[PDB]
Design a protein around this motif. Structure first.
Motif, PDB file in Angstrom:
ATOM      1  N   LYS A  61       0.704  -1.275   0.233  1.00  0.00           N
ATOM      2  CA  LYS A  61      -0.354   0.079   0.040  1.00  0.00           C
ATOM      3  C   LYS A  61       1.038   1.186  -0.234  1.00  0.00           C
ATOM      4  CE  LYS A  61      -2.056   0.875   3.845  1.00  0.00           C
ATOM      5  NZ  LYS A  61      -3.201   1.168   5.021  1.00  0.00           N
ATOM      6  N   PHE A  78     -10.379  17.482  -0.242  1.00  0.00           N
ATOM      7  CA  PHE A  78     -11.797  15.885  -0.044  1.00  0.00           C
ATOM      8  C   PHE A  78     -11.205  15.051  -0.008  1.00  0.00           C
ATOM      9  CE2 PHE A  78     -14.143  12.013  -1.202  1.00  0.00           C
ATOM     10  CZ  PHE A  78     -15.071  12.819   0.002  1.00  0.00           C
ATOM     11  N   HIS A  79      -9.839  14.458   0.062  1.00  0.00           N
ATOM     12  CA  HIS A  79      -9.692  13.386   0.459  1.00  0.00           C
ATOM     13  C   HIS A  79      -8.390  13.113   1.089  1.00  0.00           C
ATOM     14  CE1 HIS A  79     -10.557  12.249  -3.847  1.00  0.00           C
ATOM     15  NE2 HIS A  79     -11.126  11.095  -3.411  1.00  0.00           N
ATOM     16  N   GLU A  80      -8.651  12.128   2.509  1.00  0.00           N
ATOM     17  CA  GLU A  80      -7.641  12.196   3.253  1.00  0.00           C
ATOM     18  C   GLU A  80      -5.881  11.614   2.434  1.00  0.00           C
ATOM     19  OE1 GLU A  80      -8.174  12.897   7.364  1.00  0.00           O
ATOM     20  OE2 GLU A  80      -9.851  13.821   6.175  1.00  0.00           O
ATOM     21  N   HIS A  81      -6.404  10.783   1.858  1.00  0.00           N
ATOM     22  CA  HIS A  81      -4.564  10.736   1.210  1.00  0.00           C
ATOM     23  C   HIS A  81      -5.330  10.326   0.062  1.00  0.00           C
ATOM     24  CE1 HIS A  81      -6.128   6.734   3.143  1.00  0.00           C
ATOM     25  NE2 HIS A  81      -6.028   7.233   4.464  1.00  0.00           N
ATOM     26  N   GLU A  83      -4.838   6.557  -1.542  1.00  0.00           N
ATOM     27  CA  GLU A  83      -4.381   4.699  -1.556  1.00  0.00           C
ATOM     28  C   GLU A  83      -3.850   4.563  -2.515  1.00  0.00           C
ATOM     29  N   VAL A  84      -2.872   3.858  -2.739  1.00  0.00           N
ATOM     30  CA  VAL A  84      -3.286   2.990  -3.690  1.00  0.00           C
ATOM     31  C   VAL A  84      -2.049   1.515  -3.230  1.00  0.00           C
ATOM     32  CG1 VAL A  84      -1.202   2.645  -6.027  1.00  0.00           C
ATOM     33  CG2 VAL A  84      -2.366   4.969  -5.008  1.00  0.00           C
ATOM     34  N   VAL A  85      -3.440   0.369  -3.619  1.00  0.00           N
ATOM     35  CA  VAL A  85      -2.510  -0.919  -3.114  1.00  0.00           C
ATOM     36  C   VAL A  85      -2.555  -1.695  -4.133  1.00  0.00           C
ATOM     37  CG1 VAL A  85      -3.695  -2.837  -1.727  1.00  0.00           C
ATOM     38  CG2 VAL A  85      -4.698  -0.751  -0.828  1.00  0.00           C
ATOM     39  N   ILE A  98       4.011   4.137  -9.332  1.00  0.00           N
ATOM     40  CA  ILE A  98       2.887   4.246  -9.295  1.00  0.00           C
ATOM     41  C   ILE A  98       2.410   5.759 -10.285  1.00  0.00           C
ATOM     42  CG2 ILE A  98       1.747   4.816  -7.374  1.00  0.00           C
ATOM     43  CD1 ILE A  98       2.329   1.736  -8.220  1.00  0.00           C
ATOM     44  N   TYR A 105     -10.912  17.648  -5.288  1.00  0.00           N
ATOM     45  CA  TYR A 105     -11.281  16.428  -5.204  1.00  0.00           C
ATOM     46  C   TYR A 105     -11.300  15.334  -6.218  1.00  0.00           C
ATOM     47  CZ  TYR A 105     -14.453  19.460  -1.404  1.00  0.00           C
ATOM     48  OH  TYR A 105     -15.053  19.624  -0.505  1.00  0.00           O
ATOM     49  N   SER A 106     -10.635  15.079  -6.866  1.00  0.00           N
ATOM     50  CA  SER A 106     -10.306  13.340  -7.713  1.00  0.00           C
ATOM     51  C   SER A 106      -8.785  13.460  -7.287  1.00  0.00           C
ATOM     52  CB  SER A 106     -10.948  14.313  -9.127  1.00  0.00           C
ATOM     53  OG  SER A 106     -10.754  13.365  -9.593  1.00  0.00           O
ATOM     54  N   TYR A 107      -8.616  12.116  -7.728  1.00  0.00           N
ATOM     55  CA  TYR A 107      -7.028  12.132  -7.870  1.00  0.00           C
ATOM     56  C   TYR A 107      -7.547  10.069  -9.074  1.00  0.00           C
ATOM     57  CZ  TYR A 107      -7.741   8.873  -4.444  1.00  0.00           C
ATOM     58  OH  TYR A 107      -7.967   7.015  -3.397  1.00  0.00           O
ATOM     59  N   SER A 108      -6.528  10.818  -9.894  1.00  0.00           N
ATOM     60  CA  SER A 108      -5.932   9.636 -11.224  1.00  0.00           C
ATOM     61  C   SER A 108      -4.888   8.805 -10.894  1.00  0.00           C
ATOM     62  CB  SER A 108      -6.162  10.230 -12.605  1.00  0.00           C
ATOM     63  OG  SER A 108      -5.905   8.929 -13.439  1.00  0.00           O
ATOM     64  N   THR A 109      -4.977   7.388 -10.477  1.00  0.00           N
ATOM     65  CA  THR A 109      -3.811   6.740 -10.747  1.00  0.00           C
ATOM     66  C   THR A 109      -3.603   5.662 -11.596  1.00  0.00           C
ATOM     67  OG1 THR A 109      -2.003   5.151  -8.594  1.00  0.00           O
ATOM     68  CG2 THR A 109      -4.707   4.882  -8.910  1.00  0.00           C
TER      69      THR A 109
END
Ligand SMILES: CCc1oc2cc(O)ccc2c1C(=O)c1cc(I)c(O)c(I)c1
Ligand SMILES: CCc1oc2cc(O)ccc2c1C(=O)c1cc(I)c(O)c(I)c1
Lengths: 115, 115
Positions: A61, A78-81, A83-85, A98, A105-109
């Motif tokens: 993670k 928006f997000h606390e963090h 997370e990429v699992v 990664i 208010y958004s992220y792209s991974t």
């Protein structure tokens, strides 16, 4: 470099610099144990998290502290963090990047997995 | 409907149907407690997870089981799940739509927050 993280900022059109993150490996009791951590460079990249011998198959993670980044910019997130699992798997030689593209208010991974 | 989740498939250009997810809420002892769960309908939407009275201020995590979705389509994806962690209702009740756009090695998530 078996594992690298790259972070970009979609509001400023720039690398996301000085973003802290921690990497965890899932333990046998399903808890998350710390594995590596660091902050992104002026290029938005974090190198040197692990070595080939240490980076064994398993579930990992990456927790990226996006909230602190936006707070430092004076922008309400928006997000606390983020997370990429993911599972790391031995299918020949593999390097993992990664990547995360951040908005308040958004992220792209995505992952770029190469030989 | 204070909390709704919508999931789309970027390979097929369609709602992501029958995607399971679990919602958790951080307790005062900092553990994740189960809060609600469900699966997306034919529209890619999961409605009815909570109520205005139960959906109090707190930190919530939505864990979307993207791996099972891709595996049932024959694809071995990168991520174990997509995680969305956020503080809710800190300035009074709001309505939250959490959206996720899925590809095998990437996802994008956003939130639409209305008063
Ligand atoms: C096409 C590049 C790219 O586009 C994105 C769109 C997104 O929404 C999220 C992530 C990306 C993303 C990257 O992952 C990326 C960018 C650079 I500059 C790199 O050097 C490397 I390695 C990787
Ligand atoms: C999973 C939903 C979603 O996530 C995205 C992520 C992106 O980066 C770009 C677009 C989307 C997108 C949508 O197309 C969308 C959102 C809503 I709310 C809708 O009601 C309808 I119809 C469609």
């Amino acid at each position: 470099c078996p594992l690298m993280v790259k972070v970009l900022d979609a509001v400023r059109g720039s690398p996301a610099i000085n973003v802290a993150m921690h990497v965890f490996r899932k333990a046998a009791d399903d808890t998350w144990e710390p594995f590596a951590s660091g902050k992104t460079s002026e290029s938005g990249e974090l190198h040197g998290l692990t070595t080939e011998e240490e980076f064994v198959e398993g579930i990992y993670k990456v927790e990226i502290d996006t909230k602190s980044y936006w707070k430092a910019l004076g922008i309400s997130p928006f997000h606390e963090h983020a997370e990429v699992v993911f599972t790391a798997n031995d299918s020949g030689p593999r390097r993992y990047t990664i990547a995360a593209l951040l908005s308040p208010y958004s992220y792209s991974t995505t992952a770029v997995v190469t030989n």
